[PDB]
UniProtKB/Swiss-Prot annotation, chain B:
A biological process term (GO) from this entry: cytoplasmic translation
Top-rank lineage group of the source organism: Bacteria
One Pfam family hit: Ribosomal_S11
InterPro entries from the UniProt entry: Ribosomal_uS11, Ribosomal_uS11_bac-type, Ribosomal_uS11_CS, Ribosomal_uS11_sf
Protein family membership: Belongs to the universal ribosomal protein uS11 family.
Protein name, per record: Small ribosomal subunit protein uS11
Assembly mode: Part of the 30S ribosomal subunit. Interacts with proteins uS7 and bS18. Cross-links to IF-3. In stalled ribosomes contacts ribosome rescue factor SmrB.
Keywords assigned: Methylation, Ribonucleoprotein, Ribosomal protein, RNA-binding, rRNA-binding
GO molecular function annotations of the record: small ribosomal subunit rRNA binding; structural constituent of ribosome
Swiss-Prot record, chain C:
Subunit structure: Monomer.
UniProt similarity note: Belongs to the IF-3 family.
Subcellular location: Cytoplasm
Cited function: IF-3 binds to the 30S ribosomal subunit and shifts the equilibrium between 70S ribosomes and their 50S and 30S subunits in favor of the free subunits, thus enhancing the availability of 30S subunits on which protein synthesis initiation begins.
Descriptive protein name: Translation initiation factor IF-3
UniProtKB/Swiss-Prot annotation, chain D:
One cellular component term from this protein's GO annotations in UniProt: cytosol
Protein name: Small ribosomal subunit protein uS7
Any GO MF annotation of the entry: rRNA binding
Family from the record: Belongs to the universal ribosomal protein uS7 family.
Assembly description: Part of the 30S ribosomal subunit. Contacts proteins S9 and S11. Cross-links to IF3 and the P and E site tRNAs.
Claim: tRNA-binding is one of the keywords in the record: yes
Keywords: Ribonucleoprotein, Ribosomal protein, RNA-binding, rRNA-binding, tRNA-binding
Effect of residue 35 to A/E: Defective in ribosome assembly
Extra remark beyond the main annotation: The strain K12 sequence is shown. Has been predicted to contact the N-terminal domain of IF-3 based on footprint studies; exactly how IF-3 interacts with the 30S subunit is controversial.
High-level lineage: Bacteria, Pseudomonadati, Pseudomonadota, Gammaproteobacteria, Enterobacterales
Portion of the parent chain present: 2 to 152 of 179
BP GO annotations: cytoplasmic translation; negative regulation of translation; ribosomal small subunit assembly; translation
Protein's job: One of the primary rRNA binding proteins, it binds directly to 16S rRNA where it nucleates assembly of the head domain of the 30S subunit. Is located at the subunit interface close to the decoding center, where it has been shown to contact mRNA. Has been shown to contact tRNA in both the P and E sites; it probably blocks exit of the E site tRNA. Protein S7 is also a translational repressor protein; it regulates the expression of the str operon members to different degrees by binding to its mRNA.
Swiss-Prot record, chain E:
Positions marked as site (Important for 30S binding): 18, 21
Protein's cellular compartments: Cytoplasm
Protein modification: Phosphorylated on threonine residue(s).
Any single GO CC term annotated in Swiss-Prot or TrEMBL for this entry: membrane
Any one GO molecular function term: RNA binding
Family membership noted in the UniProt record: Belongs to the IF-3 family.
One biological process term in Gene Ontology: response to cold
Oligomer and partners: Monomer. Component of the 30S ribosomal translation pre-initiation complex which assembles on the 30S ribosome in the order IF-2 and IF-3, IF-1 and N-formylmethionyl-tRNA(fMet); mRNA recruitment can occur at any time during PIC assembly.
Main location: cytoplasm
Additional comment: A short form called IF-3S/IF-3 beta is found both in vivo and in vitro and is probably produced by degradation of the long form IF-3L/IF-3 alpha. The major form is the N-methylmethionine long form.
Protein name (Swiss-Prot/TrEMBL): Translation initiation factor IF-3
Organism: Escherichia coli (strain K12)
Record function comment: One of the essential components for the initiation of protein synthesis. IF-3 binds to the 30S ribosomal subunit and shifts the equilibrium between 70S ribosomes and their 50S and 30S subunits in favor of the free subunits, thus enhancing the availability of 30S subunits on which protein synthesis initiation begins.
Length: 56, 117, 76, 151, 91
RNA sequence: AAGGCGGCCCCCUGGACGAAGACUGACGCUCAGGUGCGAAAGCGUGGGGAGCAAACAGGAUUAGAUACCCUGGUAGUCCACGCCGUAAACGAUGUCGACUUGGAGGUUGUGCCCUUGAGGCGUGGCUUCCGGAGCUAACGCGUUAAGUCGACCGCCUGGGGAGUACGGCCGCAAGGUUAAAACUCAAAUGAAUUGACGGGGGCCCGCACAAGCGGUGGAGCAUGUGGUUUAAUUCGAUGCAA
RNA sequence: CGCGGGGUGGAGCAGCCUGGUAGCUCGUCGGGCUCAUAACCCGAAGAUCGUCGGUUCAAAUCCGGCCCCCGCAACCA
């Protein structure tokens, strides 16, 4: 998520863009995911569970 | 003592703390301030407000060179990712570019165990 | 052990001793700070209660590391 | 107010000037249902304020109220074991009520001889934006701007 | 200086459990603290004739090497009895 | 096949599936014993060693804290060649074959259609979620069966004792495999039900909080209680609900 | 005349060869947490650093005496 402010665009709008670029890019989610070791069995467990919830 | 007018704000925002460093394009350190060393400890150290005064204190130990434009390099997930950037812009700074540079391994090193608190 | 250094010093004037033991005399805190800076060293308040307070020009980090090293080694 | 939302009783206007606003004021100053004696004190204070301070009785009232009116405030809140302080932007109707209420309260907490003289001098002070009541607005803002981060 | 730290020896703290934390209590003393034993009887102002002074006395007698005790107190205050233990004093 | 297998490229190699037709001619299914494979940890020799981390040390927490948290950190985790042969090694469901209504998807072949659109109509392999009869103690399973049948194998016979002891075989070791009895109890167990409870959770109400106005807690007096006193201070009411 | 290690606050320590207001534990007295107590938490009290001479800018830490405790050493029949 690289951003370049355009002319006569307020610092705020550019910022809001930037934060949404990272929301889009999944940075913090990604960093959260890797802060700590997850066992393979555990991430397979996570994967099934979300497949399941993704039925409405 | 010297002149730059064109810089880059590298902000390291970890969960426990947020270090702000101002630099030229070359990557040479012009000035720095941290939250933990601006009168904030533990529970207060890890706040966006502490990161803000860090950005403020840093803009005072750099305007000796009279920077006038800069880019921002946001690293890490903590507070002061964003609030630090704000303080810079209000301190009298034109923001050219914003970039997240938080490192992402392509799954390399095994991280520490989960904390069972 | 811990000494206050550089801008933490509040004394208006101090007696200055450089890194080699040269007695520089009584200096304003401002001038003492300038001398330390040109030598890329720290201004350390080694005798807070002396009259006037005594400051020594030295590398505080290197000094502190060596002191802690000494203490640790002699106890293990 | 868990389930039942409501409207609000729309009190009669001030008998003398026909102002709903001053009716909100006499009531706020009123004590022990002494309406008769409440409006007596409000007027004599307005009369004292009006006569010897450039007249425009309703307007004089507003100049003073304009000054103690608060734009934002904080609402206490308890999340994850923590009592956070959330600054809320407050609505116009209540804005008047707080403004009126702090003017009345600062008046009784005053040294002067009667409530009418006290009320009058509170309005005057507020009109010049000084005194206790204005200071009550400022603490509200100092307290608000502080927790600006959590809005 | 000499600090006060503490250990406890409850009833049902015998050899097993006990001398493990006689090891802990060495540690306290051997930091150079005055290690205060607190008994905590299932009991009273005279709980025991057993609970306390087996334990306490054998804590002294085992630790006697490194530590000695200030007093063998045997005056309980409440439902609990402090035996006070110190570094063994150089004469 | 199971264990398990994930950056990209090449080389060597196993299996599966489809289309068409030719060939062999029941050459098939199952399998005690036997043989081979078989996560992780562990073992032996020699390499390797960033990160992680049993052990261990130090800092904290705590009544204690040989833990949970923090700062370090050895074996190990990695490679080669050997060993070990165990897991909730699980679908807790042996293998093979035949038969029995349906709906929505995923994946992967293949025949057909102005390919005239990212499609239209068929036909195989695997797979996910529902569900019909039937089955089932129920939960649930339901053409990938736990339905309807047949062929062969493995295994069970109340709980604890015990996957223990003894013997045999196996292993450098740790240990594995086969596998009892005395003794003791009237239970142990499965699924589902109504409560209660959760540091349990969700949704929702009440002047419960929030928003307000006035109080009690201070003072003097009235009054009740406790306590104390007394010959007696009569008996009862005692958390919200005295 | 005969070895060891120590002397700091009520008790036990740290501050040591690295000489500039002596800090860290248990107790002491308060405060906080609880319906209450234990436990725990915030805190304050508490000193010629054994005692002297040397030695020094200032020596807790610097040397040596006086002296004391413990250590084993010993009363080793």
């Amino acid at each position: 998520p690289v951003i370049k402010v355009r002319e006569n665009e307020p610092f705020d709008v550019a910022l809001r863009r930037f934060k949404r670029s990272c929301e889009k890019a999944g940075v913090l989610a990604e960093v959260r995911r890797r802060e700590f070791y997850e066992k393979p069995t555990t991430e397979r467990k996570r994967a099934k569970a979300s497949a399941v919830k993704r039925h409405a | 003592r010297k002149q730059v007018s064109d810089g880059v704000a590298h902000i390291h925002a970890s969960f426990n703390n947020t270090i702000v460093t101002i630099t030229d394009r070359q990557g040479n350190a012009l000035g720095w301030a941290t939250a933990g060393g601006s009168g904030f400890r533990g529970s207060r150290k890890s706040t966006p407000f502490a990161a803000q005064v860090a950005a403020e204190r840093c803009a005072d130990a750099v305007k000796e060179y009279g920077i006038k434009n800069l880019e921002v390099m946001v690293k890490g997930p903590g507070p002061g990712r964003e609030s630090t950037i704000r303080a810079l812009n209000a301190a009298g700074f034109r923001i050219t570019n914003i970039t997240d540079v938080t490192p992402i391994p392509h799954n390399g090193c095994r991280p520490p165990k989960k904390r069972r608190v | 052990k811990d000494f206050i250094i550089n801008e933490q010093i509040r004394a208006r004037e101090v007696r200055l001793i450089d890194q080699n033991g040269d007695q520089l005399g009584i200096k304003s805190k401002q001038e003492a700070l300038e001398i330390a800076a040109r030598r890329n060293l720290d201004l350390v308040l080694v005798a807070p209660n002396a009259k006037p307070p005594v400051c020594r020009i030295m590398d505080y980090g290197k000094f502190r590391f060596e002191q802690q090293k000494k203490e640790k080694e002699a106890r293990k | 107010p868990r389930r039942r939302v409501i409207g609000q009783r729309k009190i009669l206007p001030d008998p003398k000037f026909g102002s709903e606003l001053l009716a909100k004021f006499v009531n706020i100053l009123m004590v022990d249902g002494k309406k008769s004696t409440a409006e007596s004190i409000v007027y004599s204070a307005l009369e004292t304020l009006a006569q010897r301070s450039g007249k425009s009785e309703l307007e004089a009232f507003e100049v003073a109220l304009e000054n103690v009116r608060p734009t934002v405030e904080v609402k206490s809140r308890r999340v994850g074991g923590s009592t956070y302080q959330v600054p809320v932007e407050v609505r116009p109707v209540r804005r008047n009520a707080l403004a009126m209420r702090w003017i009345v309260e600062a008046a009784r907490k005053r040294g002067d001889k009667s409530m009418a003289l006290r009320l009058a001098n509170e309005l005057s002070d507020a009109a010049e934006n000084k005194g206790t009541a204005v200071k009550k607005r400022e603490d509200v803002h100092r307290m608000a701007e502080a927790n600006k981060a959590f809005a | 200086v000499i600090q006060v730290k503490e250990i406890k020896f409850r009833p049902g703290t015998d050899e097993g459990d006990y001398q493990v934390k006689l090891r802990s209590l060495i540690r306290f003393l051997e930091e150079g603290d005055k290690a205060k034993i607190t008994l905590r009887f299932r009991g009273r102002e005279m709980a025991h004739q057993q609970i306390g002074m087996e334990v306490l006395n054998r804590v002294k007698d085992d630790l006697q090497e490194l530590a000695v005790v200030e007093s063998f107190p045997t005056k309980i205050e409440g439902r609990q009895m402090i035996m006070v233990l110190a570094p063994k004093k150089k004469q």
